[PDB]
Design a binder for this molecule. Structure first.
Ligand code: NI
Length: 341
């Protein structure tokens, strides 16, 4: 049964609600982005209208084989009418194709659903600036002050300089980057650009990347592993055993691996500056864990919400425990009293 925080009152609409069978009263199903916790339940047998971005629609058609007649892509930053309700899709600064959705209810209420997002001050100059929002359905993944991490720009700087140093010291080193979903493509693309290489990968991952409208992508990626000195591997293989086994397959082309594991936040963020990060090393294999996040830090979240001044907030992440829910409500009240709304 579909939970309340996936339903949009006063409409026939649901958001990221594909795993509950046929939802009673739902005339249009919105999908914020192509991550499996959110698309869970879609397939080629789905026969209700799906509303999403153009990129999310390319992935629905090519990866899950949803038939074209049920896929309704919408342009961003553009007022659209769906089943007689005005909607707009905004960039969520999450993974490729990820959107937030503004719904303009017939009774005059305005609702923003952020999907998954990384809040940024640049959102304060989108179409959000123009009007009041009554209810916010908020990605609260890191809604606690302990959750600090660097900008994406600082993390990429660390990774490019680390990779370029290693391979200039040893021209026979291979760089490996872990992946399990779309998102975080800047990690491997930035590293391959500084090394003058294409990124090599499996046929299934190359397929996924071809759906993403990334400029000049044919120049950046390849399924020919032998021509490439940056390889992508499934995240599960990013460990000493998996990497040893990969090096064996490269036919004595390489004598060292440097590997990156993009994570979200980890507790070593509570102690160590990005500058000071060191790898785990066994023999000729080193593994860096780097805190590349596609969700808001606590401070980024707080700034967006205090700017938006919503009348009511409905969390969409960490809603399963009483202690979580109570923690989040406390922070929302602090933010409200501090800013005066
Ligand atoms: Ni996500």
């Amino acid at each position: 049964t579909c939970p309340f925080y996936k339903k949009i009152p006063g409409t026939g609409f649901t958001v990221d609600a594909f795993q509950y069978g046929v939802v009673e009263g739902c005339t249009a199903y919105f999908l914020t982005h192509f991550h499996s916790d959110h698309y869970a339940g879609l397939s080629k047998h789905f026969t209700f209208p799906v509303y999403c971005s153009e990129i999310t629609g390319n992935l629905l058609k090519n990866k899950l084989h949803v038939q074209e007649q049920y896929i309704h892509p919408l342009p961003l930053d553009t007022e659209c009418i769906v089943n007689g309700v005005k909607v707009v899709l905004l960039d969520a600064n999450h993974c490729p194709g990820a959107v937030m959705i503004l719904f303009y209810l017939p009774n005059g209420t305005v609702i923003l659903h952020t999907g998954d997002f990384r809040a940024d001050p640049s959102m304060e100059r989108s179409l959000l600036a123009d009007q009041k929002v009554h209810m916010l359905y908020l990605d609260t993944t890191y809604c606690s002050p302990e959750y600090t991490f660097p900008s994406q720009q600082e993390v990429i700087r660390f990774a490019i300089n680390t990779a370029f140093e290693a391979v200039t010291l040893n021209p026979h080193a291979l760089v490996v980057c872990g992946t399990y979903s779309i998102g975080k493509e800047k990690v491997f693309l930035a590293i391959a650009d500084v090394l003058g290489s294409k990124v090599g990968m499996s046929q299934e991952k190359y397929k996924t990347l071809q759906c993403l409208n990334i400029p000049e992508i044919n120049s950046l990626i390849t399924t020919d592993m032998c021509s490439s000195l940056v390889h992508l591997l499934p995240m599960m293989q990013i460990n000493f055993k998996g990497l040893q086994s990969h090096l064996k397959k490269c036919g004595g082309k390489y004598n060292q691996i440097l590997a990156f594991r993009p994570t979200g936040w980890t507790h070593s963020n509570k102690f160590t500056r990005i500058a000071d990060v060191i790898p785990q090393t066994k023999g000729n294999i080193s593994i860096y864990g780097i805190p590349y996040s596609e969700h808001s830090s606590y401070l980024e979240m707080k700034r967006f919400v205090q700017w938006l001044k919503p009348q009511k907030i409905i969390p969409t992440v960490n809603v399963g425990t009483w202690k979580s829910r109570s923690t989040m409500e406390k922070y929302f009240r602090e933010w409200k009293l501090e800013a005066g709304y």
